[PDB]
């Protein structure tokens, strides 16, 4: 994977000694080239993960996330061009360095071989985002935002470290290939429950899970837009990639202690989706929407069925493209109106034709029209959960109905209706943010044509 790693780190010298105006052009073009090179990673064998090196390996689960990160990186590059114009060149290059460093840690995380190496770069993503959230934020609270996001993830991260090093002393290795191949049943000894626990809350705190999610509304609604997408699109999914990994050994414990988190989640998305319907800030809805969508994933991983894992993977990638779009969409409105209140700028279809479309299928992908990959992930979860328990259907079915309730609500309360006559600064929609939405949406329908590439290794 150094055919991706080496060019990615080579973006640092190139972006750090380019001209004072070419930093945006240079970073965007070669990051896209990295995305094209990363597209070759879509190739997967029947069941053998691509073992490029001793310390790097990939399969049908890592690559779709890998392409998601690499494809994403130019998207914040173009999104940040708007509000980063009024800055010095050296600080601007510092911003680009954080994004590239964030990307580089992401690729190493997904391509990691053993759990400890995965853990190091996994957590290492906290540092670049911590600077992004805090240094370049917009409001006073961002200082409290960073601490909330940092400690929450760390509070669960440290128990996993103790459990991980404990794995090495007991099993003899932490390599994922050996762990799955040398998998042994886990006893129900009272120590083993905490052993199971210490490998879980690390992944579910950043999912986020119901209860342990408050950093999500306190960061995504408050981070800079560029940091907002990568947080929602991929960073939450870091728990997903880990959980499919760590569950290979933590069996058959999952049968019992999934329950306290299952209905914690099962009552979760319905509860969270209710909060989304009754927000006042724009970005607060999508943030609360993200945990709601992430909640069905938690059930998908934990239930441990092949169908749910495919549904987990599809919903994971689909939500990333979606949540990035709505966060980008909110940023476009926030920039002109200098706020994020929902009913502040209702009724803008008459002035924003193309935006009103970009609202339209972005919300529809949030409603998950058929046959968008959102349903393909969502429906697979439903069938797996129903096979587990019939009474499941009412809950998340009601959730995706209250999900439908709000997912038109901002469409009504941002585009439908009459403009505000005192507002007179909604200028012609610039092609930059405009083309940004195009690059968000077309891969969604393109992947809809051939979804078979994003169901993970269980397909």
């Amino acid at each position: 994977m150094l055919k991706i790693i080496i060019p990615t780190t080579m973006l640092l010298p190139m972006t750090w000694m380019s001209k004072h105006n070419m930093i945006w052009i240079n970073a965007t073009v070669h990051s896209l080239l990295i995305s094209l090179i990363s597209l070759s990673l879509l190739n997967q064998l029947g069941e053998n993960s691509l073992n490029f090196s001793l310390t790097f390996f990939s399969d049908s689960l890592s690559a779709p996330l890998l392409v998601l990160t690499t494809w994403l990186l130019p998207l914040m590059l173009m999104a940040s061009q708007s509000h980063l114009s009024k800055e010095t060149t050296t600080r601007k290059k510092l911003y680009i360095t954080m994004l590239i460093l964030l990307q580089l840690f992401l690729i190493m995380t997904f391509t990691a071989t053993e759990l400890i190496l995965f853990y190091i770069l996994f957590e290492a993503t906290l540092v670049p985002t911590l600077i992004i959230i805090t240094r370049w934020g917009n409001q006073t609270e961002r200082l409290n935002a960073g601490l909330y996001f940092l400690f929450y993830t760390l509070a669960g991260s440290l128990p996993l470290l103790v459990a991980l090093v404990y794995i090495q002393n007991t099993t003899g290795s932490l390599n994922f290939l050996i762990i799955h191949y040398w998998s042994h049943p886990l006893s129900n000894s009272w120590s083993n429950i905490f052993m199971w626990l210490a490998c879980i809350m690390a992944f579910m705190v950043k999912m986020p899970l119901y209860g342990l999610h408050l950093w999500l509304p306190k960061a995504h609604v408050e981070a800079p837009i560029a940091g907002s997408m990568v947080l929602a699109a991929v960073l939450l999914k870091l728990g997903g990639y880990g959980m499919m990994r760590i569950t290979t050994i933590l069996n058959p414990l999952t049968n019992y202690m999934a329950y306290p988190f299952l209905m914690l989640s099962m009552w979760g998305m319905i509860m969270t989706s209710s909060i989304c319907l009754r927000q006042t800030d724009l970005k607060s809805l999508i943030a609360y929407s993200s945990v709601s969508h992430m909640a069905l994933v938690i059930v998908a991983i934990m239930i441990q069925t092949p169908w749910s894992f495919m549904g987990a993977t599809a919903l994971m990638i689909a939500h990333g493209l979606t949540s990035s779009m709505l966060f980008c969409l909110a940023n476009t409105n926030y920039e002109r109106v200098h706020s994020r209140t929902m009913i502040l700028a209702r009724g803008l279809q008459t002035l924003l034709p193309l935006m009103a479309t970009w609202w339209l299928m972005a919300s529809l992908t949030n409603l998950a029209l058929p046959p968008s990959i959102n349903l393909i992930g969502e429906l697979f979860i439903i069938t797996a959960s129903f096979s587990w328990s019939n009474i499941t259907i009412i809950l998340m079915g009601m959730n995706m109905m209250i999900t439908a309730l709000y997912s038109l609500y901002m469409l009504i309360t941002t585009q439908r209706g009459k403009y505000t006559h005192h507002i007179n600064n909604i200028k012609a929609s610039f092609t930059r943010e405009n083309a940004l939405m195009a690059l968000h949406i077309l891969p969604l329908l393109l992947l809809t044509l051939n979804p078979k590439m994003i169901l993970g290794p269980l397909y």
Binding site: T55, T113, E114, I116, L117, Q168
Partner: protein, 57 residues
């Protein structure tokens, strides 16, 4: 027939021919402990490098 020994003569180290045997264990020492396994053998490169976590070499 006695002559006073000169200075330092009485302080010389003398030798005697006692017929008693030399005590093999004057201190009655117990059995000496066996030495620990001797360190020997040839040195070859460490198997699979450091063998610590993700460090292949």
């Amino acid at each position: 027939g006695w002559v006073r020994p000169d200075l330092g003569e009485l302080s010389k180290v003398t030798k005697v021919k006692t017929d008693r045997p030399l005590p093999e264990n004057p201190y009655h020492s117990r059995a000496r402990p066996e030495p620990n396994p001797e360190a020997e053998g040839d040195l070859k490169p460490a198997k699979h490098g450091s063998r610590l976590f993700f460090w292949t070499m």
